Nucleic acid binder design. Structure first.
Ligand SMILES: [Mg+2]
Lengths: 621, 84, 50, 60
DNA sequence: CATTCGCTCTGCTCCTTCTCCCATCCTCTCGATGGCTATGAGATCAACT
RNA sequence: AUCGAGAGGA
DNA sequence: AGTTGATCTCATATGGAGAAGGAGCAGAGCGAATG
C-alpha cells in the first residue's frame, strides 16, 4: 500500500501519531550551514552511512550530483532516506533562487518495479511523514496517473516510478520542477544512446543522484554516461572523453603495449580517478566490517575437453566458408560467435542432433535424444559434479546463459531423477517469489535451474551452497551477480562456485574478456598500478580451435603463470580427475583476479614547489 | 522572433531628415577653413536645404554625440573635428 | 554545440530539399545504397516520361 | 589492363589497411588472410557481366 | 552672383551564373536489387469472474 | 516486380 | 469491481540559347560655396 490515496495517507498519519503518543535523550547531528539529522535516526546508522549522509549534504551545498557506488549490501537506501529526512527536518531554506521551498520539494525515485514496494516500506518505516506514491499499476491510485503526478508535485510528495514510465511519460513528468531525482540501479542509464538515458537527462534539477553497485561494467563509456547524468560537462563530451581516456587507458592494459603506452595509460587513469573522486562514493565490504560478514567462497574454473564429435563439429565450423566470410568482412562476426558458443554448450544446438526416427522401441530413446549429456564435454563434468554433491547432500544452483541449454539441462535432470526447480524469463513474475521461497524452505529440492539474467538483483537463493556457472558471459557483472544469489548476506555455509569452460574454444576467450574488463574497472575504481597480462592479438583471435593434450598447459595458465592460480572440494576434484571425466585442469579464480632560488622564496595555499613536484612526477616515469 | 521594440509611428520621416541633416551639418564644419567654425557664425549661416530639422538642434546633437568638439575661445564657442 | 546543430539543420535542409529536387546544381546527389540516385517528386513530374 | 591496374591498387590498399592494424598491435600478420581475392575476381567478373567499364561503385 | 565644384543618382555594357530543352511508337535480353541470434523487463488491455 | 543498360523494328 | 496473459518494444553482448544580377563607370544635374 502507498499514499496514492489520500484517506490512506491520513489514516497512516493518524495511526502513527496514536502509536507515537504511547512512547511519550539523543541530540541532533548538526553538520554545517544548517543541516541536522534527527538524533534517533543518526544513531541507527553505521559510521559509513553517516559519512554518506555528510557526503550527500556536501553535494547539496555544491549543487552537484553524485554516484553512491557502494558495493551491494551496504544499505544505500538508508543513506538516501536519512539524508532526505534531514532535508525535510532541518527546513533548509534555499538561498538566492526560485526554489523557495523550506524543506524537500517533489522527489522522483526511478527504480526497477521489483524494488518499488521496498522503497515505499523503507520510507514508511524510517520517515513516516512523507507522502510516498507509486506511479504504477501496482500503485494504489484510482484516478488517471496524470493527476497523481500533479498531486505529488503540488504537495511535495515522493513519486516512485519505473524507468519505462520515465521513458513513456517524458512530458507529464519533466513538465514539473522536481527537487531531487534518484536513479536506483542507475547503471540502467549506462548506454548514452538509449532512450531511457535521454529521458532521464531531461530532468532540470541539479540534485541528481545515482545508486549503483557497478558504475561501470564493460567500458569507460558507461562511466561517461553516468557522469553526464550526475555532472553534465564534468567529463566533457563523449567523443572527447573517448579520445582522452577510453583509448589511452585501454591500449595500456595489454602486455604487448609499449612503455610509452603503459605510462600514458597510468597517467590517464590517475587523472580520471582524481576527476571522478569527489562525486563517486564507493565503499567495498572489505572497507567496512560493520555490515556483518560472509562465509568463505571457493571459486574455481574447470577446463573441460570437447568430445571427439564436438571437436569435429567445431573444427568443421571454423574451417567453414561461413567463417571465411566472417574473417573477410562480408558478414558480421555475431552469428559465428553465437554458433561457436552453441557448439561449446551442446552440439545439438548447432547441428540439430542425430536424425529423428519414428516407431522405434523405448530402449533406443536415450542415446538418440536431442541434448544427450554424453555428447557435451561440459555435461559429463556436470554429471560427475551432481553425482558427488547429491551424495554429500549439498544443494546446487545451476546457471546457464541460454534458455535452450537450460532445457537440455532440465531433460538431463529429469533423466537423472534429481528434484529441481526451474526459473527463466518465461516464468511469470508473480510466481517467481513463491519459487524462491519454496526452494529456500524445502531442502528436499536439490537443484534450482536458472538463467543468469532472470530476476534482477534481489533473488535471495541462499538455500544453496554450491554454484555451477555452465557457460561464461561477455559481461563480468552477470556472473558475479549469479554467484551472489548464493554468496550473500544470509548465507550460513561455505559456498563453492565452479565456472565451466572449454579449453581452447571461444569460451576461454570469453573468460579472458571478463578478466580484462574487470581489470579495466579496477584500474579506475581501485588502483591504476596494475600488472598487464593479455596480448591484444591473443584476446581477439576468436575463431581458432586449439585444444590441449592432457600434457599441455591451457592458454590461461600460460598467461597467469607465476601467480599461484594453477575435504569436500578436494574430494570432488579428486574424482573429477581420477575418473578421467574430461576435466583438463583447474584454476583458482580469486587468484587470477589478483592483478596486483631567486623565485618562490616568499609566499604572497599550495606552495609552487609541491604543485610542480606533482606535475613532474605525473609527467615523468 | 517573439520580441519587439517600442516604436513611434512615422519615425522614418524624422530619421531620414536627421541622418541627412547630421551629415550635412558635420560637413559644414569639415569643409570650413581649418575645419573650424564658430558656433555663432554657423547658427547665423543660412542652413542647407538638407538641414530640415534646424541647425541648433543638430549642433546640440553633434556636441552630445561627441562628433564635434567644442573649444572655448575669446571669440566664443568654436566647433572642431576631434582628433580621432 | 552550435556548430553541430548548425550542421544538423543543414543536413535536414538538404534532405527536405532532395525530397523535392534531387538535381540541385551545387550539392551532392541523394543516393540509395549501391549509389543510385533517388527519384524526387520533381523528377516524377518533369519530363516526357513524367 | 585498365581494370586490373585499379583492382591491384585496391588490393594493395586493403593489404596495407589489414597489416597496419597488426603492426599497430605489435605482431606479425598472415598475408594469406590480408589478400582479399574477391577484389580482382569480382571486379573483372562484374565489368565483363554488365559492361560498366570501371569501379562497380561508380557504375553511373 | 556666375561660376565651380563636389556629391548623388541613373542607366548603359559585359561579364558570371543558372536554368531550361533536345521525334514517335514498338520488340527483346541481361544484371542488380534482395536487410542478426536471443534472453530479459515491462506496459497494454483482451478477457475471466 | 522494379531500376538501369544494351541490341533491334517502322 | 478484481485478476490473468500474450504481444509488442526496448535494450544487451560480440551544347546552346535566353534571362537575370552584379560591378564598372561615365556623366547629368543639383545645391553649397565661393571669389
Ligand atoms: Mg536499489
Amino acid at each position: 500500500r502507498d499514499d496514492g490515496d489520500e484517506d490512506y495517507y491520513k489514516q497512516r498519519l493518524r495511526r502513527w501519531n496514536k502509536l507515537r503518543l504511547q512512547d511519550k535523550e539523543e541530540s541532533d547531528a548538526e553538520f554545517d550551514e544548517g543541516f541536522k539529522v534527527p538524533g534517533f535516526l543518526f544513531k541507527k546508522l553505521f559510521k559509513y552511512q553517516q559519512t554518506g549522509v555528510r557526503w550527500l549534504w556536501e553535494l547539496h551545498c555544491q549543487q552537484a550530483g553524485g554516484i553512491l557506488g557502494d558495493e551491494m549490501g551496504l544499505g544505500k537506501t538508508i543513506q538516501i532516506i536519512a539524508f532526505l529526512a534531514g532535508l525535510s527536518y532541518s527546513k533548509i531554506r534555499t538561498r538566492g533562487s526560485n526554489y523557495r521551498f523550506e524543506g524537500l520539494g517533489p522527489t522522483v525515485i526511478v527504480c526497477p518495479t521489483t524494488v518499488m514496494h521496498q522503497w515505499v516500506k523503507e520510507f514508511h518505516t524510517w520517515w513516516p511523514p512523507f507522502r510516498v506514491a507509486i506511479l504504477h499499476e501496482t500503485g494504489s491510485y484510482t484516478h488517471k496517473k496524470e493527476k497523481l503526478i500533479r498531486d505529488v508535485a503540488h504537495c511535495h510528495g515522493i513519486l516512485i516510478t519505473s524507468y519505462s514510465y520515465i521513458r513513456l511519460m517524458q512530458d507529464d513528468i519533466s513538465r514539473y520542477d522536481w527537487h531531487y531525482v534518484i536513479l536506483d540501479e542507475g547503471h540502467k542509464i549506462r548506454n548514452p544512446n538509449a532512450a531511457v538515458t535521454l529521458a532521464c537527462k531531461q530532468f532540470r534539477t541539479p540534485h541528481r543522484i545515482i545508486l549503483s553497485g557497478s558504475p561501470m561494467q564493460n567500458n569507460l563509456r558507461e562511466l561517461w554516461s553516468l557522469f553526464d547524468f550526475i555532472f553534465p560537462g564534468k567529463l566533457g563530451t563523449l567523443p572527447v572523453f573517448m579520445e582522452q581516456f577510453s583509448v589511452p587507458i585501454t591500449m595500456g592494459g595489454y602486455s604487448n603495449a609499449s612503455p610509452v603506452q603503459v605510462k600514458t595509460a597510468y597517467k590517464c587513469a590517475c587523472v580520471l580517478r582524481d576527476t571522478i573522486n569527489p562525486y563517486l562514493l564507493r565503499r567495498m565490504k572489505s572497507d567496512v566490517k560493520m555490515s556483518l560478514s560472509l562465509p568463505d567462497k571457493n571459486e574455481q574454473v574447470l577446463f573441460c575437453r570437447l568430445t571427439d564429435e564436438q571437436h569435429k563439429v567445431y573444427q568443421n565450423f571454423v574451417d567453414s566458408k561461413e567463417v571465411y566470410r566472417i574473417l573477410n568482412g562480408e558478414m558480421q562476426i555475431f552469428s559465428g560467435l553465437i554458433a561457436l558458443r552453441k557448439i561449446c554448450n551442446h552440439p545439438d544446438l548447432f547441428s540439430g542432433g542425430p536424425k529423428n526416427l519414428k516407431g522405434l522401441p523405448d530402449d533406443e530413446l536415450e542415446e538418440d535424444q536431442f541434448g544427450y549429456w554424453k555428447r557435451s564435454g561440459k555435461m559429463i563434468v556436470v554429471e560427475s559434479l551432481l553425482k558427488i554433491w547429491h551424495k554429500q547432500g549439498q544443494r546446487v544452483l545451476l546457471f546457464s546463459q541460454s534458455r535452450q541449454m537450460l532445457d537440455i539441462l532440465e531433460v538431463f535432470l529429469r533423466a537423472q531423477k534429481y528434484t529441481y526447480l526451474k526459473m527463466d524469463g518465461t516464468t511469470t513474475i508473480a510466481s517467481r517469489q513463491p519459487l524462491i521461497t519454496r526452494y529456500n524452505e524445502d531442502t528436499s529440492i536439490f537443484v534450482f535451474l536458472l538463467t543468469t539474467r532472470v530476476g534482477g538483483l534481489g533473488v535471495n537463493l541462499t538455500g544453496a551452497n554450491r554454484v555451477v556457472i555452465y557457460d561464461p558471459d561477455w559481461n563480468p557483472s552477470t556472473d558475479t551477480q549469479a554467484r551472489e544469489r548464493a554468496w550473500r548476506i544470509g548465507q550460513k555455509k561455505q559456498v563453492t562456485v565452479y565456472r565451466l569452460l572449454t579449453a581452447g574454444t571461444i569460451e576461454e576467450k570469453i573468460y579472458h574478456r571478463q578478466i580484462f574488463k574487470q581489470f579495466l574497472t579496477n584500474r579506475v575504481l581501485k588502483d591504476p598500478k596494475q600488472r598487464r597480462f593479455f596480448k591484444s592479438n591473443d584476446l581477439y583471435e576468436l575463431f581458432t580451435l586449439t585444444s590441449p593434450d592432457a600434457s599441455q598447459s591451457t592458454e590461461t595458465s600460460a598467461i597467469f603463470a607465476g601467480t599461484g592460480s594453477d575435504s569436500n572440494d578436494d574430494y570432488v576434484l579428486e574424482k573429477l580427475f581420477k575418473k578421467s571425466v574430461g576435466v583438463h585442469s583447474v584454476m583458482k579464480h580469486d587468484a587470477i583476479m589478483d592483478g596486483a632560488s631567486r623565485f618562490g622564496k616568499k609566499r604572497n595555499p599550495l606552495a609552487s614547489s609541491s604543485l610542480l613536484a606533482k606535475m613532474r612526477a605525473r609527467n615523468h616515469l | 522572433a517573439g520580441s519587439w521594440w517600442l516604436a513611434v509611428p512615422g519615425a522614418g520621416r524624422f530619421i531620414k531628415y536627421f541622418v541627412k541633416g547630421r551629415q550635412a551639418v558635420l560637413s559644414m564644419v569639415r569643409k570650413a577653413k581649418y575645419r573650424e567654425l564658430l558656433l555663432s557664425e554657423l547658427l547665423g549661416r543660412r542652413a542647407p536645404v538638407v538641414v530640415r530639422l534646424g541647425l541648433t538642434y543638430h549642433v546640440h546633437d553633434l556636441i552630445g554625440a561627441q562628433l564635434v568638439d567644442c573649444i572655448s575661445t575669446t571669440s566664443g564657442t568654436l566647433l572642431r573635428l576631434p582628433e580621432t | 554545440a552550435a556548430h553541430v546543430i548548425a550542421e544538423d539543420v543543414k543536413l535536414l535542409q538538404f534532405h527536405v530539399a532532395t525530397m523535392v529536387d534531387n538535381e540541385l546544381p551545387g550539392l551532392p546527389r541523394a543516393m540509395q545504397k549501391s549509389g543510385r540516385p533517388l527519384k524526387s517528386l520533381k523528377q516524377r513530374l518533369k519530363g516526357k516520361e513524367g | 589492363a585498365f581494370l586490373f591496374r585499379g583492382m591491384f591498387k585496391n588490393l594493395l590498399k586493403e593489404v596495407r589497411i589489414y597489416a597496419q592494424k597488426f603492426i599497430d598491435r605489435g605482431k606479425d600478420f598472415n598475408l594469406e588472410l590480408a589478400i582479399k581475392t574477391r577484389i580482382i575476381s569480382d571486379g573483372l567478373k562484374y565489368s565483363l557481366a554488365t559492361g560498366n567499364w570501371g569501379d562497380q561503385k561508380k557504375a553511373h
